[PDB]
Curated annotation (Swiss-Prot):
This is Lysozyme C. GO terms for cellular component: cytoplasm; endoplasmic reticulum; extracellular space. It is found in: Secreted. The lineage of its organism: Eukaryota, Metazoa, Chordata, Craniata, Vertebrata. It comes from Gallus gallus. It catalyses: Hydrolysis of (1->4)-beta-linkages between N-acetylmuramic acid and N-acetyl-D-glucosamine residues in a peptidoglycan and between N-acetyl-D-glucosamine residues in chitodextrins. The gene is LYZ. It is an enzyme of class 3 (hydrolase). Residues 1-129 form the C-type lysozyme domain.
Amino acid sequence: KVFGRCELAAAMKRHGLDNYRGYSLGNWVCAAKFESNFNTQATNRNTDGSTDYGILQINSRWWCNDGRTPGSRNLCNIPCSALLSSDITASVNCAKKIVSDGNGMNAWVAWRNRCKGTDVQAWIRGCRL
């Protein structure tokens, strides 16, 4: 499923993600924007031997598991495919848990430099809610 700006904003709010631990929707939207463009299908692939599933892209080795990743640990204790729900609730639930290890989002490559050092309004401007 896909998630437009206003929909994702309302969703991120109903989930209590806006400013969650400080991570304002601007950070989540900017990150999710270039990562999967708010999509519950845009999947990525890691060469080490893992794959990322979920709107915000979650690795099946340290964040979640899929049952095929050649050797996985899982720190979120969750099924990666579930992160592709039609509701961000799946990834938001694991994200709200993952954003509490110590590195937080200091790993997602897009957010790392495209957001953690750019702007946090261009990803919310408009859906002033």
